[PDB]
C-alpha cells in the first residue's frame, strides 16, 4: 500500500509495522471510594484533624452531590 | 416510569444523560442502601470484595491503613499519641491536598467526569496493579502488560452519611480493527551543497484500509503484534499531509539540523544507504574510498559494489540488493523549511495579516 | 536620601526596582539584625510566629524536623548513629536536590523571582494548608477553598552568617470586577451527508462589559458564584475569534470526530435537541420513529411534538418549548476544517512560504 | 449580551455562567526560610554531610546574594 | 572479522550500529562473564566500585537497601514477617511500576535509548549527586553546579541469568565554542494613544560569529561566565526572526498586555527610560512633573535633565547619559499583533485555506 | 555586533550577556543496573512477590533482549 520506492530516495525507512487494537467495554464493576479513613484503631486520636476534615468534606463533595441530585431527582 | 423529566432539570449533556440512565440501572436506591452501608463498617481492608446480590462484586478501597497497623503498642513508648496525632494530621492534610487536587473544584463535570486509573494512585493507596490483579489480569499476560494505559473510572453515586463516592470501572476487552497497520517512520540526514537537512514527517502513521490516519504517542504502546491505544487515539490527518506518506515527497518539508548531529547512514533490508559525500565510506578489501556525483544526494551499497565497507572505523558485511538503483533526483522537488516555534508561525500569520491589509 | 544610585548600579528592571524599594521599606538593616538572628536559634518549630516590633509577625519555617524528633532514644539500639547518619545524609542530599532544583541556577531573576506556594511543598516541609491556616484562613471558607491556586511569594533579603533567605508573602483579598461574566461553552456532534463534525471554539469565554476576553484553564477555578483566577488570567482574544461567540457562526470552524465518539443529543432549557438522522429517536406513547429533512442538520424536541421520547433505550420526559423553531440553514455558511498539529500548520506556512516564492 | 439564538443551531449551549473575581494585595507578611536544619538534637551527627552542605550553600546562594547586594548597595 | 552482517540483520539505524560497535569494543563476551557475575553476588552496596582488568571501573547500583537494613531484629516483635512481606510487596510493586514506566514498553529504541540521569532517580535509589560525586565531581566545583542537566546514559548489554542490564555513562568535559555570546533580552511596556503594548521577541538569543541562533530554556543554565547547555541546545532561527534582533524593529511584532500589568520604566546603563505619559514622573528638587510629546512613545532621563526623579513615591539618583537622544519615531514602522493560541493561528490558516479556495 | 541603538527605542535591554560551552565525551564508564534486589537478608521472605516479579521481568526485559541479540548475533 505504501509506495516505499519513492520514500527511500530521501530516506524514509519504517523500522516497524504492527496492527492496531481498541478496547471495548461489555460490562462494568463496582468500586467504592470511602473517603473516611476507616481506622477506629485510632484509639480516640486525630479527633481534631478528622473533625476539621469532616467540614473540609462539604467543600470536597457538596457541589458534586448537588450536580448528582439534579440528575437523579429530575 | 422515568427518572428524567426535562421541565425540572433544564440542562444536561449526552454523557450526563447516559450516566444518569446507567445510575438508574443500579437499583441501589430501590434496594435498601443500609446493607451497603452496614457492610462497609467492618471491612478494615485496603481492597476487599463485598458481593451484592444480583449485581457485580463491590470492591472497597481504603487510603492510609498501614501506619495505623504499625504504631499501636510500640508508640506507647515509641511516639506519643499527640506526636503521632501531629504525624497523622500531616498525612491526612496531605491526603486532603491530593483529593482537593483531584476531587476538588478544578474537577469540571462529575456527571461526565473521566478519571483514569493512573492519576488516582496516592488516592487509591499508591498501588495500581493489585486492583487490576483482582479484576483477574495477571500482569504476566497480553492485556495487563500491553494495556495499563487507559482503564477508566466514572462517578456513579454520592452518599452523605457514609460520606462516600461510588465509582464503576470498565473491563479491558481487546479487539482489533479489521484493516489497521501502524508504521513507525524514521529518517536520516543529508546535505545539498554544504547545507545539512532531513525530512520533517509525523513520527507514526496508521492505515485502516484505504484511509490513513495520524496517531498519538502518549497512550499508544507498541507490542510486536499490534499497536495498543487504550484511549481513543485516532485523531485525523490532512490531505496535504496524507499525500506525503503514500507516494510522493514533492510536498514533504525538510529541516536544518540541531547542531552537527545527524544520521549520515542506515542499514535497511540488508543494504547500506548513506551520504558518503559527507563522511568516510571506504571499500575494505579493495582499499579505496568511493566518491559521489554532485547531482546525487545519497549513495546506496549492496554486496555487488563492495562486499565489506568501512564507515569511520567499522567493518560492515552487506547482502543482496533489495532496492532499485539511483535515478536522477534533480527533477523531483524538495520541501520548504520547517520552524517549530509558534512565534515564527505567529509572526508570519501576522505577515499574512499584513498581506490581507 | 537614596538607596538607589544609577551610576553605580547600571542595569535593573521595573519589578527589581520596586523590590529594592520595598526591601528598603523593611528597616531590618537600620534596626539591629542580631535580634532577628538571636530569635531564630531556639525556635525549634516547623512554623512559628516570631513577632517584630512595629512590623508584621515573622513566620519561621523548618524542613525535616520529625525524624530527628523520632529516633533519639530508640536508635541507641534501633539504628546506629552512622546508620542514621547515612539515612539523614540521603534525605539531606535529597533536600539539596530539591533546593538546587528551585533555588538553584535554573532560577532566573531572584530580585523579580515569583515562587508560588504550591511548588515549595517539600521545601516548606510538604504541608501547604497549615501556613495559610496561620494566615487566618479556615479552608472551610470562601477564600481558602476557591483560591489555593496563586498565593505568591517573593525574595526580600539574604543573610550569610544566618545562611538564610527572607521572603514576604501577600494576602488573598478577593474583589470582583464590575461587569465580568464567565460562560463555559459546550457543543454536540452532528453530520452532513455521512461526514461527522462538531464546532471548534475556546472552552471558556469571559465578557467584561462590551469587551469579551479569552480565558485560562490552569489557575482558574469555578465556584457557583464566580470564576476565581488567582494568577492574572485574562489573556486577550482576536477580532476573528471575538466575532464568533457573539452573534454569528459563519466564521466559526468545524472538525471531524475522534473515532466514532460524539454527542448526538443534549437537553437544554428542558428541550431535547439532537441529530435524529443519526441515532434512534422514537416517540414513546405513539410508537413510531421520527425522520428528518436532508436540508436540516439537527432536530429539536419539546412537549408538543412528542411528550416522552426514546433515545436508544431511555425514556425522556420533556417540557415546554424555550426555543425558536428550525428555519433553513443552507444559506448560513459553515466553518473550515481544524487540525491541531503544528507540523500541518508549519507545512502550510511552508506552503504560504512557497506562495510568497 | 450573547446571541444564543444563532448558537444552538449548530449546538453551542453554555452549561454554566458565573462572575469573576481578582485578588488584591493590600499588605504583606514576613516568612523566613532557614535553609539550615536547626536540629542541634543531631548529637554531633551528620557532621560530614552538613559540612559538605555548608559548601553546597555557596553555589546555592552566592549568585542571588550578589544580585541583591547590587540592588541594595547602589 | 565482523559482528555485523547485513544479510542476517536487515534493518538498524545509525546510532544502533554505533552502539553495537561500541558494545563489541567491550570484550565482556570475549572474556569470561562469570567473573562479572560472581563479583556482583556479595557486593551488598547501593553504589560500589568493582574494577575490571584493562577496563573502566564497573559501578554497581542497588534499589531499596535501607529498610532491609532496618527491620531485621526489631520486626521480630515490631512487625511480622508477613506484615513486612506485605509492606515490601507494596514497595516492590511500586518499583515495578517505576521500571515499567521507564524500562517498560513505552520505551522506544533500547539500542539507541537515551536515558538521562535525572529521570532514573527512584530507579537509582532516589539519589543523583552521589554517583556523580563518585565520578570525581565535588558539587562545589564548576562542572557539578553549572551542569547537572544532561549527564546521559545508554544501554549496552543484557544478561538473563543475572537478570541485569549494563549501562555506560559519559564524562562531562566542558569546552566553549570559539565565538558564542548569549544575550538575555528584556522589554518594557508602553502605549500609543491609550492602547498598551510591548514587543514580542525570543527570551534568549545566541550569536556564534556572524551566525545568530535561537535558544532553549529547559536544559540551558546560566552562570556568570557562560551559558551551559548540557543537551544539544542550538535549535535554528528564521531570517524573518534573525533580521529582528540585529538592527531593525520594522518587522518585530508587538502585543497587548495581560490585564493592567506592564513595565512602564527601567534603569539601563545608569539611565532611566520610561513612558512618563503613563505614570507619575516628577523632578524631585525642582518640584514639577514632566510631560511628553504625543509624537513620542517613551521618555529617557539622565542627570542633566533632572538629577533625582520621583516615580510613584521613589527617589532615583541618576548618572551620565549613555544614549543618543530621542529622534522622531513616526517614520519607523511598528509590528503586527501576536496571539499565542493555536486555534487562532488554525482559524486563520483555515482562512488561508479559504483564500486558496 | 548588536545594534542596540535601534533596540532601546522600543525598549530592548539585555540584562545579561555570557559565553556558551558544550560538553564533550572523550571516554565512558560502566554502570550495572541489577534489577534484582540483592538482599538475601530477606530471611526466606517476599518469596511470593519476588516470584511474581521474576515473571514480570520477562515482559520487562525480553523485547530489549531480542532487540540486542539482533544487534549482536548478526
Numbering used by the authors:
A (entry chain E), D (entry chain A), F (entry chain C): 136 to 209
B (entry chain F), C (entry chain B), E (entry chain D): 227 to 583
Paper quotes:
To enter target cells, morbilliviruses rely on an envelope-anchored machinery, which is composed of two interacting glycoproteins: a tetrameric receptor binding (H) protein and a trimeric fusion (F) protein. F protomers contain well-characterized functional domains: an N-terminal signal peptide, N- and C-terminal heptad repeat (HRA and HRB) domains, a transmembrane region and a C-terminal cytosolic tail.
Here, we employed cryo-electron microscopy (cryo-EM) and single particle reconstruction to elucidate the structure of the prefusion state of the CDV F protein ectodomain (solF) at 4.3 Å resolution. This shows that the fusion inhibitor 3G efficiently stabilizes the prefusion state of CDV solF. The geometry of the structure and the fit into the map was improved manually and through several real space refinement runs. The final CDV solF model is shown in Fig. 3A and B, which displays the known “tree”-like fold of the prefusion state of morbillivirus F proteins: The HRB domain of the three chains form a helix bundle, i.e., a short stalk, which supports a large globular head domain consisting of the three subdomains DI, DII and DIII. One DIII subdomain consists of two long α-helices, five shorter α-helices with less than ten residues per helix and a five-stranded twisted antiparallel β-sheet. In the CDV solF structure, N173 and N179 are located at the top of the head domain in the DIII subdomain, and N141 is located at the bottom close to the HRB region in the DI subdomain. Interestingly, for all three N-linked glycosylation sites, additional densities were found in the cryo-EM map (arrowheads in the side view of Fig. 3A), which would correspond to glycans. Since 3G is a derivative of AS-48 and the compounds exhibit IC50s for membrane fusion in the single digit micromolar range against CDV and MeV, it is expected that both inhibitors bind to the same site.
